[PDB]
Amino acid sequence: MFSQILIIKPGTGISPNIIISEDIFPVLHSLFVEHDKKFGITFPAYSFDKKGHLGNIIEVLSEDKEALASLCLEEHLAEVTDYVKVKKEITFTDDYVLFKRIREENQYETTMHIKKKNQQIFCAYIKVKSASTGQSYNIFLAPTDIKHFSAYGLL
RNA sequence: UUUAGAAGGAUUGCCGUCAGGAAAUUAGGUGCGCUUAGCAGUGUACCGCUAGGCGG
């Protein structure tokens, strides 16, 4: 149950959130249906709760020290080598934080009470286009400790 | 322990009539506004499945 080092480089023009939401996260979506049992997704430095970026390093951990080679994130993310650098190592990882999919309610028309609860999630907001029908909306995150990910990489 | 303490100001009404402000003009001369910059903050927040939690 180890982890690989994926760093979104600081700077580079394009913001880190866009780079993750456009390159890395669809790759994870198309490479965790192969994984069956999702491997894991920790963003170190989720920062504070008034504000808070997902961070600058995404560490994908797994429930096995061999399955990390199976979904070989390195050389699948060689088209972002000026933006995301994949170190080649793995160290046993229970020293992380699990991440969850707080849902964020829907809009008024979708069907007052909306914004009462909508003001919590809407303050990480990694965007996802749908492999299905198509309507795109950000999925939201949180720090949680439940240990042993299911669909995208959340619990 | 206060120049202490007290107190109904009321009722009524026609301001009127009239009128020349007016004649003359020189405001002028002069002038360094400059230097610099991410519209960025993901820029958005949906499509479905009683309160609550969920496929992509």
The encoded tokens of residue A51 equal 């504000």
The residue that minimises its CA distance to C1' of B45 is: A137
Strand B neighbors by CB, 7 A: A 13, 15, 17-18, 21, 29, 53, 100-104, 106-107, 109-110, 117, 122, 125-128, 130-133, 135-139, 151-152
Q: Which two tokens stand for residue A23?
A: 């390159």
What ranges in A33-84 are assigned the alpha helix state H? 67-70
In this structure, are residues A101 and A88 in contact, taking their beta carbons and an 8 Å threshold?
Answer: no
Which residues does a chain break follow in chain A (C to N more than 2.5 Å)?
111, 123, 148
Nearest nt to the A139 alpha carbon by C1':
B45
Residue with tokens 């560490």: A59
The Cα A125–Cα A58 span in angstroms is 14
A55 CA – B41 C1', rounded, Å: 15
Q: How far apart are the first and last CA of chain A?
A: 16
Residue A77 to residue A45: CA distance in whole angstroms: 22
Q: Residue count of chain A, please give it.
A: 155
Residue A154 tokens, joined: 């959340």
Burial class, A139, CB count within 10 angstroms (exposed 0-12 / middle 13-18 / buried 19+): buried
| CA→C1' distance for A10 and B49 (Å) | 40
